[PDB]
Amino acid sequence: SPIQTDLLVAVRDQGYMFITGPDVIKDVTGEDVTFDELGGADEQAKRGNIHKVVNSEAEAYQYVRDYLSFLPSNHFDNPPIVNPGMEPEITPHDLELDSIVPDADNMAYDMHEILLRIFDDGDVFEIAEQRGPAMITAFARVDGHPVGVIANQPMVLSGAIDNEASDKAASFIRFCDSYNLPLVFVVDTPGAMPGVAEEKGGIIKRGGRFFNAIVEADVPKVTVIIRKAYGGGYAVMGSKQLSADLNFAWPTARIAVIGAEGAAQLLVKRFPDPNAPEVQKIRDDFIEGYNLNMATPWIAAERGYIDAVIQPHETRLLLRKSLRLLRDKQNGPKVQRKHGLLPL
Amino acid sequence: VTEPSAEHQVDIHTTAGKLADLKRRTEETLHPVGEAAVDKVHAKGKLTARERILALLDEGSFVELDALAKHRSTNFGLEKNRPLGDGVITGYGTIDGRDVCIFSQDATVFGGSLGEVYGEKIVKVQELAIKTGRPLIGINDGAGARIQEGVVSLGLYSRIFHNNIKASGVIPQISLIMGAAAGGHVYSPALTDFVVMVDQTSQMFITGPDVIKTVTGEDVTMEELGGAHTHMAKSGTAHYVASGEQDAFDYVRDLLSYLPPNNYADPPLYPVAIPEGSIEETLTDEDLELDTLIPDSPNQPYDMHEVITRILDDDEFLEVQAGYAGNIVVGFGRVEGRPVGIVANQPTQFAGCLDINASEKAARFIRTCDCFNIPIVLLVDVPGFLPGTDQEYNGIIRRGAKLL
Amino acid sequence: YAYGEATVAKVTVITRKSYGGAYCVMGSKDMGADVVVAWPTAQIAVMGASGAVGFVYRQQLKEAAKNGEDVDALRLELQQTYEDTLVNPYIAAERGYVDAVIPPSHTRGYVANALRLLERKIVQMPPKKHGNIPL
Amino acid sequence: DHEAHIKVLRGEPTPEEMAALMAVLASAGGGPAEPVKKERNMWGHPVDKLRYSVFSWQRVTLLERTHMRR
Amino acid sequence: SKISKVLVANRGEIAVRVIRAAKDAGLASVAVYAEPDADAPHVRLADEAFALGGQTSAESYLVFEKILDAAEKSGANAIHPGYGFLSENADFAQAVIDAGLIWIGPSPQSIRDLGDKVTARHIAARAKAPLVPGTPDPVKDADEVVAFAKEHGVPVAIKAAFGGGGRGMKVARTLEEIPELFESATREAIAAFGRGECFVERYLDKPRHVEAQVIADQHGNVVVAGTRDCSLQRRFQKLVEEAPAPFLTDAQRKEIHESAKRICKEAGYYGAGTVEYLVGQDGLISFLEVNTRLQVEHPVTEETSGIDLVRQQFKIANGEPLDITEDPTPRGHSFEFRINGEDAGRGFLPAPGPVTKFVAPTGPGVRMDSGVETGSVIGGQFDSMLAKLIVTGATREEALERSRRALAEFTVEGLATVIPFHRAVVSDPAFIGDGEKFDVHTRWIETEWNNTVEPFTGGDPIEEEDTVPRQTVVVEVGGRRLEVSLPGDLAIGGGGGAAAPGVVRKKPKPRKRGGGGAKAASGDAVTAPMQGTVVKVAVEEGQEVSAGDLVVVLEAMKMENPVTAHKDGTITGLAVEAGAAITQGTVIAEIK
Amino acid sequence: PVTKFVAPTGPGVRMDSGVETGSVIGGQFDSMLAKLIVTGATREEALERSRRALAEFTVEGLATVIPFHRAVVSDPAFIGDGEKFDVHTRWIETEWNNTVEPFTVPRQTVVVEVGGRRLEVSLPGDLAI
Amino acid sequence: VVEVGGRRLEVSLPGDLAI
Amino acid sequence: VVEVGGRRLEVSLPGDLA
Ligand SMILES: CCC/C=C/C=C/C/C=C/CCCCCCCCCC(=O)SCCNC(=O)CCNC(=O)[C@H](O)C(C)(C)COP(=O)(O)OP(=O)(O)OC[C@H]1O[C@@H](n2cnc3c(N)ncnc32)[C@H](O)[C@@H]1OP(=O)(O)O
Ligand SMILES: CCC(=O)SCCNC(=O)CCNC(=O)[C@H](O)C(C)(C)COP(=O)(O)OP(=O)(O)OC[C@H]1O[C@@H](n2cnc3c(N)ncnc32)[C@H](O)[C@@H]1OP(=O)(O)O
Ligand SMILES: Nc1ncnc2c1ncn2[C@@H]1O[C@H](COP(=O)(O)OP(=O)(O)OP(=O)(O)O)[C@@H](O)[C@H]1O
Ligand SMILES: *C(=O)CCCC[C@@H]1SC[C@@H]2NC(=O)N[C@@H]21
Ligand SMILES: [Mg+2]
Structure with a gap:
């Protein structure tokens, strides 16, 4: 019954969740396992069965009050509007965004330093922090209206979309759609994780479900691209081709099928091994030309795949303008039916 | 190594350099075929396609979409001239505090003739208007289809007309005509709800005077053929004939003040x-x-x-x-x-x-x-x-x- | 308006010309024609080659006149090259605006197939009280 | 205390000039805008006038939404 | 030769000050700018300019090759270094002379000899200036330091032989403090300056700081153009400065005017400069050191003595003799205030930010030397000083009264400044004095000023009532002008419309992470807390570290900020190298 | 309209002004705007400083005497020939070469009595409150 | 009546005072 | 409540004056 609900909050060292207890596991299957290893709050949060873990019941109560403060009472009614109209001019906090992205593409940064600045205040209320921590799913407010924020976290695993980041985003997108919250996508990702462990973990279906949820959702969809948007990362993170309504990039954005290093490996594997430094020199030249040309905002802007390239400081007020326009979005033409089927 | 100030460009391997590159690319969109054309339009006494948008919309409300777009044609040497925006300016903004979607066709780029990317820009802003249920304003100048682009231009016309038909009776559609609208440029205005013309600077006609002369001998001026007075008093196509561009904008704002944003919202x-x-x-x-x-x-x-x-x-x-x-x-x-x-x-x-x-x-x-x-x-x-x-x-x- | 509004099955057979705005009006694909086929003789173009060449080659046709050359024979050579290049069904088929170019005898087969499959079309407009046809 | 007050940001009026200012501003101040008895009355609401295809998703996201939103 | 085209190898207010001198000389002026300064007022003010590129000073204004290449490609014939950066780098001064350009400054050897403060002390003893009881040589070890501390008593200071900008000194009140302070100051001098050499001397608890403006000549002439008091210092840097030095006996005054000239004579100095002095509460003078450059505070001596001290540098670089023969008398009193982008309510920490407004004071007695204008932006790469305000009056009390006006007229917005501090001190009895002495001294701001300045918050909404929109209107009542701010949700006289759609209002959350017990520190990544330059990396890949251990030092605003481990673990993926530019939130390393 | 007003600053300059960026002027008042004061140790130095400061002074949106000032501070008639200069109270009109090329709602009111006071109160014409 | 700081005053206001 | 330079000044009026 709990696992059907929209939000599970567990108290650490007190809340536990498991089907079969240690004793029955032991005497049926021989394994030794403590309650923490089996179904402790932190373990089930990392496994994504719990949405929040707190140190006390009072903290759980306050987390519930905050969570409910972003939501309507039901599918039909409106949410509460909190502190509308603040800061209508460009602020120093907006102008701090022009230099927040580091100069080198191999660097990483905490995405929260962007998220705390592009919304109405620091009330970025994060959900399922521990599940798939390469992805942030949070509530925020724009001009006092709540929105759901899906943002990559370059600070973790280079922001690659793992199995749990995928299913976390899919679940949060469907929830936000059910409660009519606009979706804001903040993109900085190399795309899906490579590797046999993620393949066997199901990355094809979990990505398929993320793609399904993003196309299914009817709410306003607005996208801001920060640096990398490669391959399936570009597609899944609210691409215009996947029905996102308005798409903006910062001038640091890089939109491509694959990053320069990957394209350089596919190029160089046609040569012998790099025993001759001409091979190294060709890689270095190719990577510079690619980062000047293919891996830039400018091709997607020239083709209209993104609607504008914006100065970073514009982002907050441009999100307000965009979501005021999109307030009455009606998604269609769509054929009503029992339901849309989903990769399972 | 050091470089003189008028020559040096901030290093595009840095965030600050990429931001300066955005400022350069943006500034280039104000005069995409050079300032001599902007001067020529002012000397002819007319606003540019951008100044028209900024004069209609509430000040600072305009957000521009597809500002950096370029055509992708390679027929008859078009690849040698790829002006930014493809000669239409598109976006959204606010009139009297209510949000609207707008496009404004620019006669300086290939005569304002419709190409593929030009059409796709207009289609994007039409779809945005339909999807949001907000009025659409189109400002129209153009020598019809861009003839070096093939039937693709006719495909884009067909898509623009089909969107005007879908939006018909759903959102208020207003057409300002502020130049010669020729050929396919005339049918979108006709499908919109209200047509405002400027009493001497604008014309609409399907077939030009030279073809009319060739086929019928009727020697007619473009003003007699397609002028605002003709389309008011004779053909019945125009809804208003403004004494100037500012008067046309004032009339369009008056019109918008009576209409609801869509067929289901309450009236103002x-x-x-x-x-x-x-x-x-x-x-x-x-x-x-x-x-x-x-x-x-x-x-x-x-x-x-x-x-x-x-x-x-x-x-x-x-x-x-x-x-x-x-x-x-x-x-x-x-x-x-x-x-x-x-x-x-x-x-x-x-x-x-x-x-x-x-x-x-x-x-x-x-x-x-x-x-x-x-x-x-x-x-x-x-x-x-x-x-x-x-x-x-x-x-x-x-x-x-x-x-x- | 009438053609774009109509939601019954729509089939277009192009037999020689479909020029300019009349291409758009007479059942273009992007107006929502369900099946478009063209006969080998179809001619789909922005305008007739006479008018097109005089515009596209303005540079050459002014320059040759200032040189005093046989501008008339040059216009005929350019017009022939344009007609042979662009005034055919194939540029529209390449764009996919014609779904098939067919032997004319196939017309009844393609039409009957379309009409048999499209007797119910699952298509819709935005909700409205009614349209506002130009009247 | 957390109310937003009127601030005389510049000047230093006497209590008579304060009283004049307040009596002017208080009688200029708007009346019962957004009135307390704005009843619900959905009779003939525009959303019921529209034609909807039998499968139109706007039957969910417009018609039902508009009737049920409270 | 004579200067014709001069390159000003510096930025900001001093760059404009030198360009303005060049215009007042008819010289052609060449500027240079780093990438951040591509829009700075001096680039517009110069007759010509060149972009060095590079974001940090260390890859811009400090690069000899880039400055010499700018002078060559511009065809300049003279270089003025301003202050800071290369202005006291004797190796650059040499390279400028042997590049065949007029070095507008003192000769390299004089810069070297005065840059070694112990060689400067040997010269000052030769010149028989008064020195504080202190070691005449570098000390060997703490055992000698304790010996001296018993032979000449306590309190005692340990000072680096090459330290400067306020870093170089630490003091013991007691004999038990000597060992660890000697260890620290030794290894910290080795780290910051390479030269670990230190010397030890008696410490004044509450000294005033006084200095002579010296003009010196290739023809062997020297003039004391004036004197200044600079005792208002926040760390060991100045903030407010006076000319002439107030509240001194004429014995002290004349002894300064004598010993400064003797020091210049013995040093072989030429060009502008200063001799700094400390003055005790006992009234005893001691020589401090000689700055081999145009000081920041030349303006107050320009206003009181009437000399254009930069144009004098042009004359001296031309090798012309001094056309002033003797020490000019003052004709009034002047104060300079540094407009630092520092929050006095937050420990005078500097902060970058936009200058969204800059309305300078004007009119009676007021001079503004601003390196900034409305719409300028300050990043964390260069010192916080925006501008200098100089105010003059016919007597110190009138100059203070004018300064009170000017500082109340000054408005700067968008970033924190020390202006609220200047507005306080121009009204604090400790600095007004009793008519014959101050209570201020070079530790007064950090210990005995009442820091009543509340922290900067810009325009941010902080409390619930700040969130309500406001309309500000001008009203006349009885013809009296009032400015009245009306809340948008104002309701009086039974009015409605407040919170119209059912708005909720609450105290908005600060734009920072939760901050209770952790911020990012809940994770493994170490992230940079502000924009700066990674000037020191204190770890290597794979090192085990413990909470509190130093990971990197970020230079920002030329302040050094340590970034330190929040947890124990293994340094993994150390992403940065010494000298890298870094941004707030950038991941430095994972402690994993 | 005084659409821009960048006053000169720096060494040896004082500015006393009645206008700032965004001011307006009309013929009912003096049509003066400001007074630039320049000083030095000598006449020649003060002229050098003036030849700077008058070029640093930028005013836009209306015509000003600044180009005349910039010219006259350049004129050997006005530069001292040691112990004399040629200018006179007719010099601008009769001797200087003037070659400079030419430049190319109502508020609400209420009358209110408060005790013995009579007080007009006047307010912006559109006060929403 | 208007009280300003608690000091009682009386104010006479035009028969058409609004906005 | 009205503030004059931030000095508080409670003011009272009849409950209607519109
Ligand atoms: C009621 C309402 C209900 C509503 C319900 C709604 C529900 C609906 C929801 C809707 C759901 C949405 C559905 C989804 C949306 C779309 C998402 C997709 C976009 C992406 O997410 S986009 C990823 C980025 N995309 C790659 O990495 C590929 C490439 N990157 C890789 O890493 C790949 O793993 C791989 C294996 C392909 C690379 O490896 P390789 O390319 O296979 O091989 P190689 O390069 O070694 O071959 C040599 C190469 O040289 C050339 N060549 C010359 N000679 C020969 C020769 N003789 N033989 C072969 N090749 C030759 C040639 O180019 C060849 O390449 P090739 O032949 O082209 O492959
Ligand atoms: C279904 C729609 C069609 O079939 S369009 C067929 C008719 N279009 C025409 O080009 C002829 C009819 N009208 C014109 O072009 C006239 O130029 C109009 C629009 C009436 C205005 O004349 P005027 O102001 O003198 O312009 P112009 O002839 O000097 O041309 C100026 C520049 O614009 C260009 N231009 C013009 N029309 C087109 C067009 N349809 N396609 C492509 N380019 C066009 C001209 O070539 C010229 O550019 P440029 O100066 O040569 O670089
Ligand atoms: N012997 C001393 N007794 C007391 N205070 C001293 C003494 N020597 C220095 N100080 C204090 O140290 C401050 C800094 O002076 P110091 O010469 O040590 O460094 P500095 O001013 O940064 O040097 P530099 O000008 O060479 O860069 C002085 O203003 C004074 O406050
Ligand atoms: C740094 O940003 C440029 C020079 C400013 C610092 C220098 S240090 C030595 C001088 N003394 C002072 O207070 N500022 C000057
Ligand atoms: Mg010094």
Whole structure:
């Protein structure tokens, strides 16, 4: 019954969740396992069965009050509007965004330093922090209206979309759609994780479900691209081709099928091994030309795949303008039916 | 190594350099075929496609979409000239505090002729308007299809027309014509709800004077063929003929002030305080001026505006198609703040008879009000239909049945 | 308006010309024609080659006149090259605006197939009280 | 205390000039805008006037939404 | 030769000050700018300019090759270094002379000899200036330091032989403090300056700081153009400065005017400069050191003595003799205030930010030397000083009264400044004095000023009532002008419309992470807390570290900020190298 | 309209002004704007400083005497020939070469009595409150 | 009546004072 | 409540003056 609900909050060292207890596991299957290893709050949060873990019941109560403060009472009614109209001019906090992205593409940064600045205040209320921590799913407010924020976290695993980041985003997108919250996508990702462990973990279906949820959702969809948007990362993170309504990039954005290093490996594997430094020199030249040309905002802007390239400081007020326009979005033409089927 | 200030560009391997590169690319979009063309348009006394948008929209409200777009044609050497924006400016903004979607075609880029990317930009902003349920304003100049681009340009015309048909009766569509709209450029205006023209600087025609001369011998100027006066008084296509571009924007804002944003939103009522007491207790001297209006002879005409302006609030009345079929007057007003459409016989023309042109004028106005839930008030003073074989042979039966 | 509004099955057979705005009006694909086929003789173009060449080659046709050359024979050579290049069904088929170019005898087969499959079309407009046809 | 007050940001009026200012501003101040008895009355609401295809998703996201939103 | 085209190898207010001198000389002026300064007022003010590129000073204004290449490609014939950066780098001064350009400054050897403060002390003893009881040589070890501390008593200071900008000194009040302070100051001098050499001397608890403006000549002439008091210092840098030095006996005054000239004579100095002095509460003078450059505070001596001290540098670089023969008398009194982008309510920490407004004071007695204008932006790469305000009056009390006006007229917005501090001190009795002495001294701001300045918050909404929109209107009542701010949700006289749609209002959350017990520190990543330059990396890949251990030092605003481990673990993925530019939130390493 | 007003600053300059960026002027008042004061140790130095400061002074949106000032501070008639200079109270009109090329709602009111005071109160014409 | 700081005052206001 | 330079000044009026 709990696992059907929209939000599970567990108290650490007190809340536990498991089907079969240690004793029955032991005497049926021989394994030794403590309650923490089996179904402790932190373990089930990392496994994504719990949405929040707190140190006390009072903290759980306050987390519930905050969570409910972003939501309507039901599918039909409106949410509460909190502190509308603040800061209508460009602020120093907006102008701090022009230099927040580091100069080198191999660097990483905490995405929260962007998220705390592009919304109405620091009330970025994060959900399922521990599940798939390469992805942030949070509530925020724009001009006092709540929105759901899906943002990559370059600070973790280079922001690659793992199995749990995928299913976390899919679940949060469907929830936000059910409660009519606009979706804001903040993109900085190399795309899906490579590797046999993620393949066997199901990355094809979990990505398929993320793609399904993003196309299914009817709410306003607005996208801001920060640096990398490669391959399936570009597609899944609210691409215009996947029905996102308005798409903006910062001038640091890089939109491509694959990053320069990957394209350089596919190029160089046609040569012998790099025993001759001409091979190294060709890689270095190719990577510079690619980062000047293919891996830039400018091709997607020239083709209209993104609607504008914006100065970073514009982002907050441009999100307000965009979501005021999109307030009455009606998604269609769509054929009503029992339901849309989903990769399972 | 050091570089002189006028030459050096901030290193695009840095965030600050990429930001400066964005500022360069943005600045280049203000004059995409060079400032000599902007100067040439000002010397010809006209606003540029960007200045038109910024003069219509509320100041600083404009957000531009696809600013950096370029065409991708390689036919007949077009790849050698790829001006930013492809010669149409598109986006959204606010008029009088209500949000609207806008495009404005730029005659300086290939004569404003429609290419593939130009069409895709217009389609994007049409779809945005339909999807949001907000008015669409199109500002139109253009020498039709961009002939070096193939049938692709006709495909994009077909898509633009199909979107105008979908949006028909869903969102208010307003067309400003501010130059020569030639060929396919004329059919989107015709499919929109209201057409505003500028009285000497704008024309619409399907086939140009040179082809008309070749096929018929009729030697006609482009103004006589497609001018704003022609499309008001003769063809009945234009809804307003502004004395200038600013007057056209003022009329478009007046129009938008009566309309709801879409067919399901509530109309924009002004706050008016209703005075207490009976209808007979609340007669003003301006009402009492109506009791003596009607001449004693049943056949002596009078100006119906003397009724319209007295029953409307503030006497304020936005007449539509004022120069066409003057035997019927149609237009917007307010009654206690509620928008209304007036449809009134005008005794001073054809003694108030109905004819073909008045019947079509009133029929489309009524159906436009009915789409957008605007109540209609009819002021009736009609002796019959206009007698004549010209009316019979031109179809007064078939086209009078439109107003029924 | 009538063609773009209509939601019954729509089939277009192009037999020689479909030029300019009349291409758009007479059942273009992007107006929502369900099946478009063209006969081998179809001619789909922005405008007739006479008019097109005089515009596209303005540079050459002014320059040759200032050189005093046989501008008339140059116009005929350019017009022939344009007609042979672009005034055919194949540029529209390449764009996919014609779904198939067919032997004319296939017309009844393609039509009957389309009409048999499209007797119910699952298509819709935005909700409205009614449209606002230009009247 | 957390109310937003009127601030005389510049000047230093006497209590008579304060009283004049307040009596002017207080009688200029708007009346019962957004009135307390704005009843619900959905009779003939525009959303019921529209034609909907039998499968139109706007039957969910417009019609039902508009009737049920409270 | 004579200067014709001069390159000003510096930025900001001093760049404009030198360009303005060049214009007042008819010289052609060449500027240079780093990438951040591509829009700075001096680039517009110069007759010509060149972009060095590079974001940090270390890859811009400090690069000899880039500055010499700018002078060559511009065809300049003279270089003025301003102050800071290369202005006291004797190796650059040499490279400028042997590049065949007029070095507008003192000769390299004089810069070297005065840059070694111990060689400067040997020269000052030769010149027989008064020195504080202190070691005449570098000390060997703490055992000698304790010996001296017993032979000449306590309190005692340990000072680096090459330290400067306020870093170089630490003091013991007691004999037990000597060992660890000697260890620290030794290894910290080795780290910051390479030269670990230190010397030890008696410490004044509450000294005033006084200096002579010296003009010196290739023809062997020297003039004391004036004197200044600079005792208002926040760390060991100045903030408010006076000319002439107030509240001194004429014995002290003349002894300064004598010993400064003797020091210049013995040093062989030429060009502009200063001799700094400390003055005790006992009234005893001691020589401090000689700055081999145009000082920041030349303007107050320009206003009181009437000399254009930069144009004098042009004359001296031309090798012309001094056309002033003797020490000019003052004709009034002047104060300079540094307009630092520092928050006095937050420990005078500097902060970058936009200058969204800059309305300078004007009019009676007021001079503004601003390196900034409305719409300028300050990043964390260069010192916080925006501008200098100089105010003069016919007597110190009138100059203070004018300064009170000017500082109340000054408005700067968008970033924190020390202006609220200047507005306080121009009204604090400790600095007004009793008519014959101050209570201020070079530790007064950090210990005995009442820091009543509340922290900067810009325009941010902080409390619930700040969130309500406001309309500000001008009203006349009885003809009295009032400015009245009306809340948008104002309701009086039974009015409605407040919170129209059912708005909720609450105290908005600060734009920072939760901050209770952790911020990012809940994770493994170490992230940079502000924009800066990674000037030191204190770890290597794979090192085990413990909470509190130093990971990197970020230079920002030329302040050094340590970034330190929040947890124990293994340094993994150390992403940065010494000298890298870094941004707030950038991941430095994972402690994993 | 005084659409821009960048006053000169720096060494040896004082500015006393009645206008700032966004001010307006009309013929009912003096049509003066400001007074630039320049000083030095000598006449020649003060002229050098003036030849700077008058070029640093930028004013836009209306015509000003600044180009005349910039010219006259350049004129050997006005530069001292040691112990004399040629200018006179007719010099601008009769001797200087003037080659400079030419430049190319109502508020609400209420009358209120408060005790013995009579007080007009006047307010912006559109006060929403 | 208006009280300003608690000091009682009386204010006479035009028969058409609004906005 | 009205503030004059931030000095508080409670003011009282009849409950209606519109
Ligand atoms: C009621 C309402 C209900 C509503 C319900 C709604 C529900 C609906 C929801 C809707 C759901 C949405 C559905 C989804 C949306 C779309 C998402 C997709 C976009 C992406 O997410 S986009 C990823 C980025 N995309 C790659 O990495 C590929 C490439 N990157 C890789 O890493 C790949 O793993 C791989 C294996 C392909 C690379 O490896 P390789 O390319 O296979 O091989 P190689 O390069 O070694 O071959 C040699 C190469 O040289 C050339 N060549 C010359 N000679 C020969 C020769 N003789 N033989 C072969 N090749 C030759 C040639 O180019 C060849 O390449 P090739 O032949 O082209 O492959
Ligand atoms: C279905 C739609 C079609 O079939 S379009 C067929 C008609 N279009 C035409 O090009 C001829 C009719 N009108 C014109 O082009 C005239 O130029 C109009 C629009 C009436 C205005 O004349 P005017 O102001 O003198 O312009 P112009 O002839 O000097 O041309 C100026 C620049 O614009 C260009 N231009 C013009 N029309 C087109 C077009 N349809 N396709 C492509 N380019 C076009 C001209 O070539 C010229 O550019 P440029 O100066 O040669 O670089
Ligand atoms: N012997 C001393 N007794 C007391 N205070 C001293 C003594 N020497 C220095 N100080 C204090 O140290 C401050 C800094 O002077 P110091 O010469 O040590 O460094 P500095 O000013 O940064 O040097 P530089 O000008 O060479 O860069 C002085 O203003 C004074 O406050
Ligand atoms: C740094 O940003 C440029 C020079 C400013 C610092 C220098 S240090 C030595 C001088 N003394 C001072 O207070 N500022 C000058
Ligand atoms: Mg010093």
